[PDB]
Amino acid sequence: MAEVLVVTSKVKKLIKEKGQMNTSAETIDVLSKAIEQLCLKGVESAKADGRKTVMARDIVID
Amino acid sequence: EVLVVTSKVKKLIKEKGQMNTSAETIDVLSKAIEQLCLKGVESAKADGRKTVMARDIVIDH
DNA sequence: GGGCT
DNA sequence: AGCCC
């Protein structure tokens, strides 16, 4: 799907290796929505600063 | 290390923002995913489950 | 590599 | 001049 923004295999490997847990399909969808929201907040910060580039300091996790 | 699909993130930010994406931006997004997944493991384990589910990924903040 | 922010 | 397409 063109909608998936996370590397499914690497996310499942992290959760398996660090948690001994499986990962639901819906977990991948929520993580992809999280990325989309972070990128859109990033665009707003960069635009407010009059920049053309989304930089690390534009991505704030509360 | 990289947990986001770099080409799709750059396409989203280019298409939705008419902006470039810094290399460090990709690293911060990957750190964000790692932290969300590890908080997910905590919630799932606390609930006695063997699967990280959507309700384990808390993002409303 | 070839420009750009 | 460091860094992005």
Residue numbers in the entry:
A (entry chain B): 1 to 62
B (entry chain A): 3 to 63
Q: What did the published study say regarding this structure?
A:
In this study, we present crystal structures and biochemical characterization of the free and DNA-bound forms of the histone homolog HBb from the predatory Gram-negative bacterium Bdellovibrio bacteriovorus. Furthermore, we establish that HBb is essential for maintaining bacterial viability. Building on this, by employing various biophysical and biochemical approaches, we further substantiated the ability of HBb to bind and compact DNA by bending in a sequence-independent manner.
Similar to its free form, HBb successfully crystallized in complex with a randomized 20 bp DNA fragment (20 bp-GC50) within a few days, yielding the two distinct crystal forms HBb-DNA_1 and HBb-DNA_2. For HBb-DNA_1, the asymmetric unit contains a 5 bp dsDNA fragment, which forms an infinite dsDNA helix throughout the crystal via crystallographic symmetry. Both monomers of the HBb dimer interact with the minor groove of this DNA. Specifically, residues K12 in helix α1, T23 and S24 in loop l1, and A25 in helix α2 of one monomer, as well as K52 and T53 in loop l2 and R57 in helix α3 of the other monomer, form an interaction network with the phosphate groups of the DNA backbone through their side chains and backbones. The superposition of the HBb-DNA_1 and HBb-DNA_2 structures illustrates the location of the combined HBb-DNA binding interfaces, resembling histone-DNA complexes found in eukaryotes and archaea.
